[PDB]
Design a protein around this ligand. Structure first.
Ligand code: HEM
Ligand code: NA
Ligand code: NA
Length: 1254
């Protein structure tokens, strides 16, 4: 008897081989990847190398069987290190021939050949035959009489003659081409022909462009495995057609619907990530598997998914033929509660909406009733398009009688639900909110109201709340959140009542793509899939937020359209700190032995301006600063003078001012030139030590000279010649030639590679200075033209992501963004930068703690910084432990190696990681490497230095045993190190609790909530999303440092609300567990040629002195509208949040400065009149936040300051009516505090105004 073993084989192919077997002396068996030690009892071994993932030990077991004398063959290995074979050349060709071609005839001949040739014991076996060869490029179709038989054709003419004989050809019909081999598409082909199309099935792996050009189809459907190429992208742009890409699941239907992930690892990259670079859309799950009577798997298309897919194809193709005068479009925007303004990331929303409607009217769309100008449009939206909170009963009862909403009856709602949703999922809505219509905006008759504003065939709707205002801040484990009736009825009315032809989301970003449950490859139980339906979907997104835009593409099936960012300018604060710089200049040039009188002069001004608080220095009477302390002051002041700030917000269809065009190009080009020249001088061995220690010297030698060069090239772009490049860099012409040659090979010693990269940065920047100015002027026009083309069924070209300063390749805008492949991270470049940043973290800690190293470091991982840096934050985590990645021949990281203790030169340091929901979708396999590396380092024995990773495991186990856990459980849980949100939610849920000031008393209540909401475990696939009590707490012991990444030039620590939600929350939780406040650092990725670590309190001082206390910044913002005024209230709210999380980072003098500017008008700018005419609701929020800090004790304000704030607050409310946000209309204790500080007559009038809305 002959025994043959199969390893890591696919279920479908393995079953086919076993069926084709007919000899009674051939036995087939399967061996798992953990049973490789049984291979010595077999006569032949087959190994599937397609996507195999093994370790060195597993590889060694296979290698030993080959040297024993066991025949081994590996099929289609992707990693060359796994290619193991010990057969003759003739035998390899024969086995490959049978296997590659396939078919049941080839399979059975293969089994007989093994027993005859390889085994040797001929005995009883029939005659074998040569493998049968199949065409590699052809068109195929199923047999008309016998569908089991398949027809093959070699030319397009042969196929077209076949169709006419069988009456499959329709005159004048549209053509669709199908490519790919991942699944059986017999049902898809037949369903499309019943719809009235001509279908051309093509199976050609290499030369598919020859077939496409002869047919000239109207659409292409690809079952993608990999990327098609750049030749395909050029054809699509020239022909202006679409490309689709459905998905395939290799399991049963029931198994797929119970999996919380869907896809991961290499298979996700081949199916989703890589096709996006070509510009594919609609990653719709269509194919699955089923078992037959005998027990064999087969591939088919799910009948319910097939109906929705064919309907989607019709809708996209009908956009091209339907006249513009009959199309219907729906647009969604995001608005604040009450009387707050419309918001989007760096955009003026209301003027942008008006410009879009004017463009559509010219194109021929049916738009009527449009107001005169954008000011009139804003008033109509407030009157007929507002949203309200749950507690403002008096507010939305008045809207029902003055806003004329859309009324939905019970019969309409139930017919829509029975057609779109599943009975079990709709039952969850009833359990949480009750029967239709609910309680929010309900007429006495029993109907539901929808707020909308319609102009002919175009309707505008606001987006409601996706959750419930239960005011329960702790998440319950095991239950998902369902949207309320109002949220559901809005999207179902669009599909069935309004019958829209297209759907648009206006700005960054909504909340539809963050609803439960599955990550990718959604099913019929997922809300984002059901609420969109079969309607074409378009989404306007900003280029500075690439990380979060991937959720919209992969979960809501959206096509992204990119728009610009606000312009940049200089801070212009150099004149304020000019006197301080002169004192430092004299001190540096003093050659006297005793430089104390000069040192005391510098100290006097530093204390007067309050700078000593930002740098953590002393304010002693007669103690002069040392040499090192003065150097720190000089660098802090020079950083303020060279800071870049954003100006007026961006309006669609309007370019920048001529002055702002000039300054934006200055920001995009000065820095790359200056730092590239600095690197070249350092390598050649020049006197660069002085400039590297002082930033004032660097400005005079590398920054100012580079600014003049940019000025010349802007006026005369024709001077960008090879003579200017060689002379600017100080290199001879022949050296420039070899520099371009190294770039060509990679698209040599380590020194040469570094030299080549610096030269390429200088050359690339100089030759594109003229293009930068032209791209900014023409971008606003291309954004409107690209959107009009999309609404006619055209093609949108792909693009990468990132703000123009970080990545100049993102211009012009109006394109579709994509991401990177996560299986190759951390990259070679990212590994070098991560090592350098990890050494700065240790050095900075030792300076402040007397040469001591930390015991544990904590990290936060975000999606946007992962894509743009290539995984630089993961490199820092691995280097702390002392583990390095291992790469294969194709640059993919799948294994780890331990760094020897002597080479490390220091003790190992333990880590703990928290993640966001967006990151877990992009790179889930990288999280498995991090937790595997922790267990590798904790088992490392015989180290020259101390192993602090092993000490943390012992301490964590002791805590768990004290809490009352089993000895077996305590040992297992003591190694959990990766955590995230509970129930798979995308955030922490802590902003709602912090900003509800009257519902908590101590900070220990907030800490308990944070530990509950972020205590889920995501460190392995087997225990994915498992909650264990006390697991998060035991992992935070002995923590010393908290690290937060930062990569964008558009937001800072005080301007983004997520920063204090994650970084602040971790800081608060550690303080309550260890009893000691840790250090907080920032990883600065903004300058790609110069990365550094910065202290949190120093970064706050820089931002406040340049944005909210800077007269230049304020006057730029006072030229905008309602959206610009809303940013002032957002910064004040984040300052309140930071004071709760980390009290030591916010000084009392910071609150006083804000008071002098916005309550007293110290700078004489007239800020109060600006708010009264643009957005009175933003001024109410600012005064209420400041009064809440005084009540809680966070700010030690005086009686005069409190009286003035209370007087201003009640005056705005009585004149312009309450806005009713959380602070103004839902804080009972704050209401009483304000009333007692004002006049008795004013108090009564103030109280009655609030009661009219509640
Ligand atoms: C009948 C033909 C093929 C089938 C059924 C197939 C199927 C698969 C599957 C199932 C995986 C993932 C394995 C796993 O996740 O365990 C994979 C990975 C992969 N395949 Fe294919 N494939 C085929 C042909 C090809 C070809 C011709 C190429 C040429 C380059 C290719 C390139 C890749 C790559 C790059 C990966 C990623 C592996 C990794 O990242 O570790 N495949 N393939
Ligand atoms: Na957000
Ligand atoms: Na907030």
């Amino acid at each position: 008897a002959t025994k043959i073993a199969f390893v890591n084989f696919q279920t479908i192919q393995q079953g086919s081989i076993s069926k084709a077997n007919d000899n009674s002396f051939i036995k087939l068996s399967e061996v798992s990847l953990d049973n490789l030690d049984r291979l010595t009892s077999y006569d032949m071994v087959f190994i599937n190398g397609m996507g195999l993932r093994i370790v060195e030990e597993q590889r060694q077991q296979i290698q030993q069987a080959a040297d024993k004398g066991i025949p081994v063959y590996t099929s289609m290995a992707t990693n060359p290190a796994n290619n193991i074979c010990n057969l003759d050349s003739i035998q390899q060709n024969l086995i490959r021939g049978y296997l590659s071609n396939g078919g049941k005839t080839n399979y059975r001949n293969m089994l007989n050949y093994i027993r005859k040739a390889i085994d040797g014991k001929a005995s009883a076996v029939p005659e074998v035959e040569d493998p049968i060869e199949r065409p590699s490029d052809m068109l195929y179709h199923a047999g008309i009489s016998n569908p089991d038989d398949e027809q093959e054709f070699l030319t397009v003419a042969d196929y077209e003659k076949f169709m006419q004989e069988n009456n499959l050809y329709k005159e004048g019909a549209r053509k669709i081409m199908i490519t790919g081999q991942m699944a059986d598409a017999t049902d898809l082909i037949k369903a499309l022909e019943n719809a009235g199309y001509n279908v051309y099935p093509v199976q050609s792996m290499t030369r598919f462009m020859s077939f496409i050009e002869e047919v000239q189809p109207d659409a292409v459907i690809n079952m993608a495995h990999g990327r098609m190429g750049d030749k395909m992208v050029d054809y699509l742009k020239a022909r202006n057609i679409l490309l689709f890409a459905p998905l395939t699941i290799n399991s049963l239907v029931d198994e797929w619907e119970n999996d919380p992930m869907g896809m991961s690892g290499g298979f996700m990259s081949q199916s989703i990530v890589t096709p996006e670079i070509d510009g594919a859309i609609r990653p719709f799950a269509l194919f699955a598997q089923y078992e037959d009577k005998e027990g064999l798997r087969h591939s088919y298309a799910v009948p319910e998914r097939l109906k929705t897919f064919v309907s989607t194809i019709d809708n996209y193709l009908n956009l091209k033929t339907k006249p513009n005068f009959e199309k219907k479009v729906a647009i969604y925007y995001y608005k604040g509660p009450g009387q707050n303004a419309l918001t989007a990331a760096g955009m003026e929303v209301v003027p942008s909406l008006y410009n879009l409607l004017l463009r559509m009217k010219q194109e021929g769309y049916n738009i009527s009733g449009l107001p005169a100008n954008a000011q009139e449009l804003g008033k109509m939206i407030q009157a007929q398009g507002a949203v309200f909170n749950a507690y403002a009963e008096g507010a939305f009862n008045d809207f029902m009688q003055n806003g004329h909403p859309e009324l939905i009856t019970k019969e309409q709602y139930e017919s829509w639900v029975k057609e779109s949703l599943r009975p079990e999922k709709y039952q969850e809505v009833v359990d949480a909110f009750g029967e239709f219509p609910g309680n929010y905006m309900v007429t006495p008759d029993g109907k539901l109201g929808i707020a909308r504003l319609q102009f002919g065939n175009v309707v505008l709707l606001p987006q409601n709340a996706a959750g419930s205002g239960d005011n329960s801040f702790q998440v319950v484990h095991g239950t998902d959140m369902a949207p309320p009736h109002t949220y559901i009825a809005s999207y179902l009315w669009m599909q069935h009542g309004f019958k829209a032809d297209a759907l648009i989301h206006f700005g960054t970003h909504g909340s539809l793509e963050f609803t439960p449950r599955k990550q990718v490859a959604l099913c019929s139980n997922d809300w984002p899939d059901r609420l969109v339906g079969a309607v074409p979907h378009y989404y306007l997104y900003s280029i500075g937020n690439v990380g979060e835009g991937m959720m919209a593409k992969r979960r809501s099936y959206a096509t992204l359209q990119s728009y610009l960012t606000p312009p940049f300018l200089e801070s212009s604060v150099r004149g304020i700190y000019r006197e301080l710089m002169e004192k430092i200049k004299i001190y540096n040039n003093s050659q006297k032995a005793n430089k104390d009188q000069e040192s005391l002069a510098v100290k006097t001004l530093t204390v007067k301006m309050g700078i000593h608080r930002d740098l953590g220095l002393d304010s002693m009477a007669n103690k002069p600063y040392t040499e090192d302390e003065i150097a720190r002051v000089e660098n802090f002041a020079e950083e303020l003078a060279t800071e870049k700030i954003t100006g007026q917000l961006y309006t669609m269809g309007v370019p920048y001012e001529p002055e702002r065009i000039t300054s934006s190009v200055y920001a995009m080009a000065t820095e790359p030139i200056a730092y590239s020249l600095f690197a070249l001088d350092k390598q050649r061995g020049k006197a660069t030590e002085s400039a590297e220690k002082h930033r004032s010297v660097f400005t005079q030698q590398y920054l100012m000279p580079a600014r003049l060069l940019v000025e010349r090239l802007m006026a005369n772009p024709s001077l960008a010649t090879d003579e200017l490049i060689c002379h600017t860099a100080g290199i001879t012409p022949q050296e420039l030639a070899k520099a371009r040659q190294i770039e060509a090979e990679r698209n040599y010693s380590k020194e040469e590679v570094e030299f080549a990269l610096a030269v390429a940065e200088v050359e690339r920047t100089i030759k594109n200075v003229g293009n930068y100015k032209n791209a900014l002027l023409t971008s606003p026009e291309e954004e409107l033209s690209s959107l009009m083309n999309a609404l006619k069924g055209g093609y949108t070209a792909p693009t990468p992501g990132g703000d123009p300063i970080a990545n100049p390749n993102t211009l012009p805008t109006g394109r579709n963004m994509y991401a990177i492949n996560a299986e190759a991270t951390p990259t070679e470049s990212a590994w070098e930068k991560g090592i350098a940043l990890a050494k700065q973290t240790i050095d900075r800690y030792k300076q402040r703690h007397n040469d001591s190293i930390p015991r544990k470091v904590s990290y936060t991982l975000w999606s946007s910084e992962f894509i743009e840096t290539g995984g630089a934050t993961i490199a820092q985590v691995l280097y702390m432990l002392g583990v390095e990645p291992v790469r294969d021949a194709f640059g993919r990281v799948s294994d780890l190696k331990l760094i020897p203790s002597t080479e490390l030169g220091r003790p190992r340091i333990d880590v703990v990681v928290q993640t966001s929901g967006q990151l877990r979708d992009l790179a889930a396999s990288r999280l498995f490497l991090i937790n595997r590396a922790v267990e590798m380092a904790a088992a490392a024995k015989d180290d020259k230095y101390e192993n602090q990773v092993a000490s943390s495991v012992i301490e964590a186990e002791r805590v768990l045993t004290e809490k009352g856990l089993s000895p077996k459980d305590a040992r297992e849980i003591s190694t959990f190190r990766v955590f995230g949100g509970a129930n798979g939610m995308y955030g922490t849920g802590i902003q709602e609790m912090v900003e509800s000031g009257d519902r908590w008393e101590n900070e220990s209540e907030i800490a308990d909530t944070y530990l509950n909401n972020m205590g889920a475990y995501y460190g392995s696939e087997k225990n994915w999303e498992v909650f264990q009590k006390f697991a998060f707490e035991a992992a935070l012991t002995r923590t010393d440092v908290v690290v937060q990444p930062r990569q964008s030039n558009t937001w800072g620590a005080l301007s983004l609300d997520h920063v204090y939600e994650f970084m602040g929350g971790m800081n608060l939780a550690v303080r309550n567990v260890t009893g000691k406040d840790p250090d907080a650092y920032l990883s600065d990725y903004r300058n790609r040629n110069h990365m550094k670590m910065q202290e949190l309190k120093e970064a706050v001082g820089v931002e406040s002195r340049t944005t909210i206390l800077n007269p230049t910044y304020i006057k730029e913002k006072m030229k905008g509208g309602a959206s610009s005024a809303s940013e002032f209230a957002e910064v004040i709210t984040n300052t309140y949040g930071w004071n709760v999380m980390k009290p030591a980072a916010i000084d009392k003098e910071l609150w006083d400065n804000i008071y002098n500017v916005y309550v007293k008008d110290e700078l004489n700018l007239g800020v109060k009149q600006y708010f009264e005419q643009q957005n009175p609701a933003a001024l109410e929020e600012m005064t209420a936040v400041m009064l809440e800090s005084a009540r809680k004790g966070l700010w030690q304000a005086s009686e005069e300051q409190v009286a003035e704030l209370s007087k201003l607050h009640t005056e705005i409310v009585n004149t312009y009516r309450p806005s009713c946000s959380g602070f103004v209309c839902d804080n009972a204790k704050l209401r009483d505090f304000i009333a007692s500080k004002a006049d008795a007559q004013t108090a009564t009038q103030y109280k009655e105004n609030i009661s009219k809305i509640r």
